[PDB]
Amino acid sequence: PIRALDEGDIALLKTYGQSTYSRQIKQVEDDIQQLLKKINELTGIKESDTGLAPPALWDLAADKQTLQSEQPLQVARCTKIINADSEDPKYIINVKQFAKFVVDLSDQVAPTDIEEGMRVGVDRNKYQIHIPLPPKIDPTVTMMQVEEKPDVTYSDVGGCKEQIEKLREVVETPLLHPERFVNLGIEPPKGVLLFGPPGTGKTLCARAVANRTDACFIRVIGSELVQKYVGEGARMVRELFEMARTKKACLIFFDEIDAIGGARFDDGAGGDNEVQRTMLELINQLDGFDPRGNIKVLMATNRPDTLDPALMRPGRLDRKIEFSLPDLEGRTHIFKIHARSMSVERDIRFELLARLCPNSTGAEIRSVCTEAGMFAIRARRKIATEKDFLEAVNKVIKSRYMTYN
Amino acid sequence: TKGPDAASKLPLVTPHTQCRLKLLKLERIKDYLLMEEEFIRNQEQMKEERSKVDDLRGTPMSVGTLEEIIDDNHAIVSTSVGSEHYVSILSFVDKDLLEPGCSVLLNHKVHAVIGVLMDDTDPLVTVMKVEKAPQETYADIGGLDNQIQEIKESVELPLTHPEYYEEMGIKPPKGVILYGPPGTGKTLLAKAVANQTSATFLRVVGSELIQKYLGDGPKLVRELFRVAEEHAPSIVFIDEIDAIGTKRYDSNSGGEREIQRTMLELLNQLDGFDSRGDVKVIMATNRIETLDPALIRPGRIDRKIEFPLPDEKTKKRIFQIHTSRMTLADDVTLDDLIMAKDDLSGADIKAICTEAGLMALRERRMKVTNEDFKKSKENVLYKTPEGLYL
Amino acid sequence: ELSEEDKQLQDELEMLVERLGEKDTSLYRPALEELRRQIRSSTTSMTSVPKPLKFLRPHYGKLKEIYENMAPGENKRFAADIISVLAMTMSGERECLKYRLVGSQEELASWGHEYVRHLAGEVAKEWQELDDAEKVQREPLLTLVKEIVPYNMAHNAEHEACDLLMEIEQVDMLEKDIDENAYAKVCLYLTSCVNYVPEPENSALLRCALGVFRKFSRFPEALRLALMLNDMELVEDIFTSCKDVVVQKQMAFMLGRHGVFLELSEDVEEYEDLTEIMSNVQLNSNFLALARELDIMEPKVPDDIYKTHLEDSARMNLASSFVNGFVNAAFGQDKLLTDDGNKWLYKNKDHGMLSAAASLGMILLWDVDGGLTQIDKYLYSSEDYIKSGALLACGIVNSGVRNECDPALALLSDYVLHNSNTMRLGSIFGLGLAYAGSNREDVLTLLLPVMGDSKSSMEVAGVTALACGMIAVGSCNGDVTSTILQTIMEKSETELKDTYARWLPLGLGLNHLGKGEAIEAILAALEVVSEPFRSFANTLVDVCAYAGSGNVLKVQQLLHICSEHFDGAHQGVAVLGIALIAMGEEIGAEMALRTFGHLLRYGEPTLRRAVPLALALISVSNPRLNILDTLSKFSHDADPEVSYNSIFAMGMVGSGTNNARLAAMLRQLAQYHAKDPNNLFMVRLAQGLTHLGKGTLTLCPYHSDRQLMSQVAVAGLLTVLVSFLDVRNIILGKSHYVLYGLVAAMQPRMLVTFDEELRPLPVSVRVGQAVDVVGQAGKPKTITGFQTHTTPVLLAHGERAELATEEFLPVTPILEGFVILRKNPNYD
Amino acid sequence: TRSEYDRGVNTFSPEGRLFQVEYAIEAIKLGSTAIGIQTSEGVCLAVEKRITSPLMEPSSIEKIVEIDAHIGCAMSGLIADAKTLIDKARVETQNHWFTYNETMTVESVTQAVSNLALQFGEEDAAMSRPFGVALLFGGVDEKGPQLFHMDPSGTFVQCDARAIGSASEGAQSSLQEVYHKSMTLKEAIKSSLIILKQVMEEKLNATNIELATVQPGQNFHMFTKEELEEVIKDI
Amino acid sequence: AHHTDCTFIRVSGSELVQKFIGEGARMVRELFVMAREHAPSIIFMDEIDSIGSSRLEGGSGGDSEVQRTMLELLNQLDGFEATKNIKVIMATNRIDILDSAL
Numbered sequence A: 001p002i003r004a005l006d007e008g009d010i011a012l013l014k015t016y017g018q019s020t021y022s023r024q025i026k027q028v029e030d031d032i033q034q035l036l037k038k039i040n041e042l043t044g045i046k047e048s049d050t051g052l053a054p055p056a057l058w059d060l061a062a063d064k065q066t067l068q069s070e071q072p073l074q075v076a077r078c079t080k081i082i083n084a085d086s087e088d089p090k091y092i093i094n095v096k097q098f099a100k101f102v103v104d105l106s107d108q109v110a111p112t113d114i115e116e117g118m119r120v121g122v123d124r125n126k127y128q129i130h131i132p133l134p135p136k137i138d139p140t141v142t143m144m145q146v147e148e149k150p151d152v153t154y155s156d157v158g159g160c161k162e163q164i165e166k167l168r169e170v171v172e173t174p175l176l177h178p179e180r181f182v183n184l185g186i187e188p189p190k191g192v193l194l195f196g197p198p199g200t201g202k203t204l205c206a207r208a209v210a211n212r213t214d215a216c217f218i219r220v221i222g223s224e225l226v227q228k229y230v231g232e233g234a235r236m237v238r239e240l241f242e243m244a245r246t247k248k249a250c251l252i253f254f255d256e257i258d259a260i261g262g263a264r265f266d267d268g269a270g271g272d273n274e275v276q277r278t279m280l281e282l283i284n285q286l287d288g289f290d291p292r293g294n295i296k297v298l299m300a301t302n303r304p305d306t307l308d309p310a311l312m313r314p315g316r317l318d319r320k321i322e323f324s325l326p327d328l329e330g331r332t333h334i335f336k337i338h339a340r341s342m343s344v345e346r347d348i349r350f351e352l353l354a355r356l357c358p359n360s361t362g363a364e365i366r367s368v369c370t371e372a373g374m375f376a377i378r379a380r381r382k383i384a385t386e387k388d389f390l391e392a393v394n395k396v397i398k399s400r401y402m403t404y405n
Numbered sequence B: 001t002k003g004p005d006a007a008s009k010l011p012l013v014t015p016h017t018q019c020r021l022k023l024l025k026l027e028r029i030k031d032y033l034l035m036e037e038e039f040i041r042n043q044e045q046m047k048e049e050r051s052k053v054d055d056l057r058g059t060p061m062s063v064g065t066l067e068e069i070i071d072d073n074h075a076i077v078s079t080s081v082g083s084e085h086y087v088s089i090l091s092f093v094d095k096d097l098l099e100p101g102c103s104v105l106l107n108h109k110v111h112a113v114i115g116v117l118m119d120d121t122d123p124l125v126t127v128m129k130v131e132k133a134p135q136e137t138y139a140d141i142g143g144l145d146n147q148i149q150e151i152k153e154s155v156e157l158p159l160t161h162p163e164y165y166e167e168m169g170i171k172p173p174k175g176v177i178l179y180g181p182p183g184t185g186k187t188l189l190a191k192a193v194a195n196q197t198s199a200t201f202l203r204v205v206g207s208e209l210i211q212k213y214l215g216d217g218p219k220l221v222r223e224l225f226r227v228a229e230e231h232a233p234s235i236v237f238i239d240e241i242d243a244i245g246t247k248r249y250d251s252n253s254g255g256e257r258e259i260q261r262t263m264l265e266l267l268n269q270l271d272g273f274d275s276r277g278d279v280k281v282i283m284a285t286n287r288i289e290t291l292d293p294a295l296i297r298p299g300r301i302d303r304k305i306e307f308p309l310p311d312e313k314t315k316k317r318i319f320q321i322h323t324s325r326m327t328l329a330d331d332v333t334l335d336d337l338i339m340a341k342d343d344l345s346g347a348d349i350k351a352i353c354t355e356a357g358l359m360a361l362r363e364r365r366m367k368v369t370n371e372d373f374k375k376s377k378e379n380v381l382y383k384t385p386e387g388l389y390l
Numbered sequence C: 001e002l003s004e005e006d007k008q009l010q011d012e013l014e015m016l017v018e019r020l021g022e023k024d025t026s027l028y029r030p031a032l033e034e035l036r037r038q039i040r041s042s043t044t045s046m047t048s049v050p051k052p053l054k055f056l057r058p059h060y061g062k063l064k065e066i067y068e069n070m071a072p073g074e075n076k077r078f079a080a081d082i083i084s085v086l087a088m089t090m091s092g093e094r095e096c097l098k099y100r101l102v103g104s105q106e107e108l109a110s111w112g113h114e115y116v117r118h119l120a121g122e123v124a125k126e127w128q129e130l131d132d133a134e135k136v137q138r139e140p141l142l143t144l145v146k147e148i149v150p151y152n153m154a155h156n157a158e159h160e161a162c163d164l165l166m167e168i169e170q171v172d173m174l175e176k177d178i179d180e181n182a183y184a185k186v187c188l189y190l191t192s193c194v195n196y197v198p199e200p201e202n203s204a205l206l207r208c209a210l211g212v213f214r215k216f217s218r219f220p221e222a223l224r225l226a227l228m229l230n231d232m233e234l235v236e237d238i239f240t241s242c243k244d245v246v247v248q249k250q251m252a253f254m255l256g257r258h259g260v261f262l263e264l265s266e267d268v269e270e271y272e273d274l275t276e277i278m279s280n281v282q283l284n285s286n287f288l289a290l291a292r293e294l295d296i297m298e299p300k301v302p303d304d305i306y307k308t309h310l311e312d313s314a315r316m317n318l319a320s321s322f323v324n325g326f327v328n329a330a331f332g333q334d335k336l337l338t339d340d341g342n343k344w345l346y347k348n349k350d351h352g353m354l355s356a357a358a359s360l361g362m363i364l365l366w367d368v369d370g371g372l373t374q375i376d377k378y379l380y381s382s383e384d385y386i387k388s389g390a391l392l393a394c395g396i397v398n399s400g401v402r403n404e405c406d407p408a409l410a411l412l413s414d415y416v417l418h419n420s421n422t423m424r425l426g427s428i429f430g431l432g433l434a435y436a437g438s439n440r441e442d443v444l445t446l447l448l449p450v451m452g453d454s455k456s457s458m459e460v461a462g463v464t465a466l467a468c469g470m471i472a473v474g475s476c477n478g479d480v481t482s483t484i485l486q487t488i489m490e491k492s493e494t495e496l497k498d499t500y501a502r503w504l505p506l507g508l509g510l511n512h513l514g515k516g517e518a519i520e521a522i523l524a525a526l527e528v529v530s531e532p533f534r535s536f537a538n539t540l541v542d543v544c545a546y547a548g549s550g551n552v553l554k555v556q557q558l559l560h561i562c563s564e565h566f567d568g569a570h571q572g573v574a575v576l577g578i579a580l581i582a583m584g585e586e587i588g589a590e591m592a593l594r595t596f597g598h599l600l601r602y603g604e605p606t607l608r609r610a611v612p613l614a615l616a617l618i619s620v621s622n623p624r625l626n627i628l629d630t631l632s633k634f635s636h637d638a639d640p641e642v643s644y645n646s647i648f649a650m651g652m653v654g655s656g657t658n659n660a661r662l663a664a665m666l667r668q669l670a671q672y673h674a675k676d677p678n679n680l681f682m683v684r685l686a687q688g689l690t691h692l693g694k695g696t697l698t699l700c701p702y703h704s705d706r707q708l709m710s711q712v713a714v715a716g717l718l719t720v721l722v723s724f725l726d727v728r729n730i731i732l733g734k735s736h737y738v739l740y741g742l743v744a745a746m747q748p749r750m751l752v753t754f755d756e757e758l759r760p761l762p763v764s765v766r767v768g769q770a771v772d773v774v775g776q777a778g779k780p781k782t783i784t785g786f787q788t789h790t791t792p793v794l795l796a797h798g799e800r801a802e803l804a805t806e807e808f809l810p811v812t813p814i815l816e817g818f819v820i821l822r823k824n825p826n827y828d
Numbered sequence D: 001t002r003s004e005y006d007r008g009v010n011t012f013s014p015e016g017r018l019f020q021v022e023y024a025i026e027a028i029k030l031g032s033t034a035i036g037i038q039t040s041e042g043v044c045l046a047v048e049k050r051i052t053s054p055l056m057e058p059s060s061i062e063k064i065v066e067i068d069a070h071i072g073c074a075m076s077g078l079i080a081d082a083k084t085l086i087d088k089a090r091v092e093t094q095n096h097w098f099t100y101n102e103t104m105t106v107e108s109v110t111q112a113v114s115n116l117a118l119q120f121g122e123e124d125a126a127m128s129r130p131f132g133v134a135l136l137f138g139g140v141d142e143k144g145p146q147l148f149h150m151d152p153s154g155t156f157v158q159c160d161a162r163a164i165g166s167a168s169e170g171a172q173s174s175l176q177e178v179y180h181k182s183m184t185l186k187e188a189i190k191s192s193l194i195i196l197k198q199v200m201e202e203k204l205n206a207t208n209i210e211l212a213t214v215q216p217g218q219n220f221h222m223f224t225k226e227e228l229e230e231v232i233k234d235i
Numbered sequence E: 001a002h003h004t005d006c007t008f009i010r011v012s013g014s015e016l017v018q019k020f021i022g023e024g025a026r027m028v029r030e031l032f033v034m035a036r037e038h039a040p041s042i043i044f045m046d047e048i049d050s051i052g053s054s055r056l057e058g059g060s061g062g063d064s065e066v067q068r069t070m071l072e073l074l075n076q077l078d079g080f081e082a083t084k085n086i087k088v089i090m091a092t093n094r095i096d097i098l099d100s101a102l
């Protein structure tokens, strides 16, 4: 009992209930769309900045720099000088990803400054050496290091006194005052694992460490250590620890190390043994058949129960520190720190607010202060009041206890 | 500091009805477009050293990863096949702009540094930009006044009036999570933000940052936030984030560990060691309870916005909005559908309107009616024992 | 594939039509009766697929043949009506009325309303395709229109009637069918259509809406429309054709906000009160009350704006004077000049002094007596520049306020024709910006004589042109046009290449602002100038004529001018003109923004410098990220002039907004251009503009509902921007005083309420974006994004205020500026 | 790790802790603060009443109750456990009076209530979890005014001044700062109300507090509205 | 499929379930790109309860990857940039288990 629209039904519904302007509107909209397409087509495509310098800094005749000094020397690592056979050196080279070769020098004005593994330059057709090069630096690991100190001090970390003291001891006192440790005959811990509920001042304490320390600080991107090409992650961690050893006093800061390696149980993880392998290399570097030098490690993690026991062992992570939820004094101090810069009344009870926010983290308290300011803004008021802070607490901490009176 | 990318969008013709005023407005848009087209045509119709410099530049220029720049005219580059060469740098290159890892350009044959190509953004992350702007303004969102206010305070006020916050030393929220049942405006309130924002909008779906190989998901997340930080202000909208971000349990498989690694990379980008620019994140979720606390943390997600099923007045707003463009008859009182205390999302209400229109068309009538709306309500909605309480 | 009943109806119609075919000529009438009955029963029903219409589709031609072949008589037309109702569905040669005219002429509603809509559209279409002849063929169409307009009135289709009448080109009959329950939804629709149609239809619609408003005694709306039409006789009629005094007070407020001033005889009930309101003698007091009610009367020195403490030779000090004037504008109080005094009006290194003194005038803005006092302290100086600046300061002080005495006239006339081109050059400009909207003959009789004399440079002549144009904006004052044309015709190719000669064509255009077509004469009496100064004059006068007209043809001509390659300044004028013709309708403005971007990319330097000025003009005191981002990415340009213009445009677009993400741009830009004084000056000036009046004044030349274009504001904006058309010489040098032309534009951005006694009534209002939900071709706009305040209050761009409570009824349905509120009798 | 050691009240953790007793002590905090002060002139109790909304007449929130004519109890924690322990205290005081024909001392009644509270899972007492309520018994006996504090673990101890409830940590510090032995009862009342006003999110006025006092003389007296307003006038 | 003149695409069963990580989502994206290219398109999806059913808590006993595939399909059906002319015919044998999002 439901007819189907015929030719006439459709030819009348498109022509009977109809505005006398509908056709013109439709045509004009289609024209606008087509014109937009055509305009985008004509002016489309910008000029992708290619890196050209401003004119008058260039130097033509560089076609001669391209025809002379032409040799686009490949880089090779002399892995064996074949004993030099006294005369007739007959060096060996290890052009990576390409081949091994037996070659000689060519116009090498210092045939003695060749060594083994010196990263020589080698021509394309005849593989004679032309010029040595300095050792590889691995730009990824090179930029892993922190250069600009973050603007966080040991005064914006409120509610963490014992943890700050332990971290300061382990990470700074062996660096700035070795006299006490050598006097007492105690080798201070070399390795700290900061663990606690998400958001308690772990990375904030790491930032404060980075700001205070006068020593190499290496923030390790947990994603940069995982790659394709099995063995690449292990190679990167090896080179990272090599550079750390090169530096006089180094402070590595593996953040969210739960990414790089938990338990080693593979079972169905046959495809995830590469991460376990790089974690094993990290373990070896942290403590193995070799002194580690003046390298101190920081390791931040919310969940230090998925981690490998071989990594959590107190020969690699020696001073495990827990960032617990701050007590009432800590919460009051965090409120004071975070509301120092806020435009607030002069009689707000931050002790009361710390009481109102139990089992709350420093990030939670920061959010409370921000929402108090936001409530003040949402009323055209310049000074956030105790009422606004209480509203912010109610909105952030919680979002009936009539049995607990 | 390349600058906002924005999203070009034409004006909006206020009268939705088919009348001469709408025709005049559309004709004005069209005539301006025609003048622009003819102006471009006339520019190109009325229109040496750099040409020869480009001729000297290689014809099929290759792209290689610079590594350990040396001297002032010689650097080591990579061929993107693992091999690396001790190449020279022509004077054409900028210099003082090459950095290790930068995807420099190399002459095809002689292999000399001749360009820098500082636009090596991956296609996977260039596609996820917003160049159009969906035509879903805030006037298409019935109700949700509090949710709209929250998101405006988070991603609009900090760009339109950046004096309120500096006037009290407060940093506005950098992260919002829109959580709620299946269909309540969670995606409309990102579409409206994209429509009304001057910032670079970046659509993403949590099921898209996951990649096949090892270490590629984290790399994609890092690249996404790198581009989102180069373009500023920018908003990154991760729809259905519970694709990646679910609770971080102790994995036994390898793919699960890689997915959690991607999630940790996202966490570090949201709130990590170093810093975060003016990139604001909006995640969307159906089931928030299953998300990891470290992700829902109120340093990465300052605001959490629930989108509950609409109440009566909001439902009336939805019906008004979705029947506005409909030739509603005078026999229809959109109150019987409102009052029924049944779970009705805005999506359900729109489906009800569409099905009522289809019922009218089936009955051969172009004007909907109350019986049509009743039938549509009955036939659209698909989905405690009696007397157990009371 | 049909139904049994459907097939039976098909068969019935077939039998009836076949009988019509048979040449009985005896039973035609019953068959035609039956066909008509079925057709009207189907059409009048709610079915959108009328079955008799569907089934008579094949027989259309047969019905045509039967109509042709039947003998003349009643049956002829009785079947022509059937053919018409059938033709409602199949068309292409547009028959429905072609057979309705030879018809039964019954009520044009029995055939449903779809027939009415089709026939209305077809009447319009026939109307366009009729030449001026065939008038006899045109009366029968007006009968259909008189049958259609009432029917659309009765059926909520007021927009349909308006479309029919404005497309028939006779918007005159609405007055017969409008009712007190329709005037709103018809006037709003006409006004919306006005912006987008060309002349003479623009004025036709405006006068139709004005007549509708006057019918139902909606005087304030009638006056707004009468001001849209720059016609003073109509506004005089409206303002004097009223018997309620309070509404006349409100209309006087409206006239004062606009540049107009009506010379009323000794007849109105309260002539003196009305002339006081219309003269803005209470603007200073109201402004100071608003400032007190917000805690802003605390003068802030330039350093507070520069904010260089956190995060002085000759020119940055001129910037300090300018920013001090801009920030502390109309407040009276200051801390640099006012107080210590004699310190930032000295050490300004000669020529800048002339503007520093003028800064005083802008601090004592709308304050004639305090002006007098402080300025007179400085009006007697050993060096000429101070006296010139003091005279300009008097002019600024009297700007916007129509004092019954003429302090500006006396003081500045003593010094017009003075034996020095510097006292002349401040007194002339002071008179120009003091009596801008005045159009007084006694000031022009003193100014025009000074453009011609051996003792006048191009500077003095150009400033006299500017002054005379500002005095007589949009009045086609014969004396002004004649004198300007004489001055242009009496100078050689050289001596006409000074860039101070831009101001003679600028005076012409200002004197013809908005007049439009009527300008041919002046562009026909001006086709004798040299080539390089005739494209400029022609283009400038043309763009001034179509100021806010939104004429796409003129914009097309300007874009053609831009396309031309001249290795040329008229191109720069044409860019500003594209901005100027399109500052009205909103849809035009965004599209112009796209065009200006294309001009920045596909453009030679000459128009590249001009695009920033266009961006500033299209958005004035309306900071939007689309324009601010554009200008910011161009604030670092290699070309100095494009930079300078981009910085000043950032200042203008954010003028009087205190925008924080513009103040940040300006500070970072101040460090970036620290070592370039010529950019540092301009960034400082942009900062001063951004903090103009410390967030209490707007330079937008559009006030009432964004719909009334103040002639004087456009005059000032054009003076400043055209001067920027040569920044490096006009303003980055000698004539930096021209910036004070902006005085003509700055006008408070506040809502202040009163009772029916000119006494404040703090009342609660909701302030929010000018948004709507559904236009529905006539539905008003309702605020979305409420935020409740208590008046007095400041309204930003795009903000409207609606009385939060019903306790009071506004006289005008526009809550911007000064509003008189009657205490509602109903309740609340 | 506290998932195999805090699921029962008779399971020790590797550190030797009863996490269920810990959790009852934590449940104490969810109640409203109560400050008791012992002085040579008597004992004062002052509690933050926490009216959730009007229409609930104040004499249904029993934070301060009477044990015999010479003891009062200021409570914080679960209302049900509060009622149980208060009833035990009253019945024990009456039993001691019946047997020995004298008034039970505050220490002895606190000891009896604590003896009831010890029996978490002791299979000869029937309660299966610690009473999540902490009490302040302020009374007067032959040893002068005394105040005793009892916690869920059954541990009781005298206190020259104490504060239990939500604002316990932040109010005991104020009590330490302000309390000295040579204090009068009026001074104690004033100081306790000052601390309550400090630690309350609501304003101190008339209702939302209760105040009571037991002196060497008149019986346990709960200040009514008049006395409460008189003290609040110039707290 | 026989009677329509629109491009008919067909998924069915677990054709979008791949052992590699994040491959079902990619296959769904490529599918809908292909449908958009050859629009108007009709995408049949037989036995969708295989690929798309009530979501399980992310843990050791949950198919998080198939859940990700379904989430990608949801986003393709209705997210940003709504589909232009793609119509979807899903087929299931038991509807009570399909995700409320679908």
Ligand SMILES: Nc1ncnc2c1ncn2[C@@H]1O[C@H](COP(=O)(O)OP(=O)(O)OP(=O)(O)O)[C@@H](O)[C@H]1O
Pocket: A156, A157, A158, A159, A160, A196, A197, A198, A199, A200, A201, A202, A203, A204, A205, A300, A301, A302, A326, A334, A337, A361, A362, A363, A364, A366, B267, B271, B272, B294, B297, B299
């Ligand atoms: N003890 C504290 N003192 C001050 N601010 C704190 C404290 N704890 C947290 N915060 C605030 O929280 C944020 C710091 O969070 P942080 O990066 O330390 O978290 P986290 O513990 O490393 O978390 P996760 O690793 O789970 O992301 C900043 O807003 C900081 O102000």
Ligand SMILES: Nc1ncnc2c1ncn2[C@@H]1O[C@H](COP(=O)(O)OP(=O)(O)OP(=O)(O)O)[C@@H](O)[C@H]1O
Pocket: B140, B141, B142, B143, B144, B180, B181, B182, B183, B184, B185, B186, B187, B188, B189, B285, B286, B307, B318, B321, B345, B346, B347, B348, B350, E078, E079, E101
């Ligand atoms: N408040 C609302 N106002 C108007 N339309 C609404 C509203 N809520 C939902 N809709 C309608 O729902 C449909 C899309 O809803 P939307 O995309 O916002 O849902 P969602 O919350 O993202 O859902 P999901 O969890 O399934 O992705 C559109 O028809 C939109 O109009």
Ligand SMILES: [Mg+2]
Pocket: A202, A203, A204, A300, B271, B272
């Ligand atoms: Mg962290």
Ligand SMILES: [Mg+2]
Pocket: B186, B187, B239, B240, B284, E078, E079
């Ligand atoms: Mg969604």
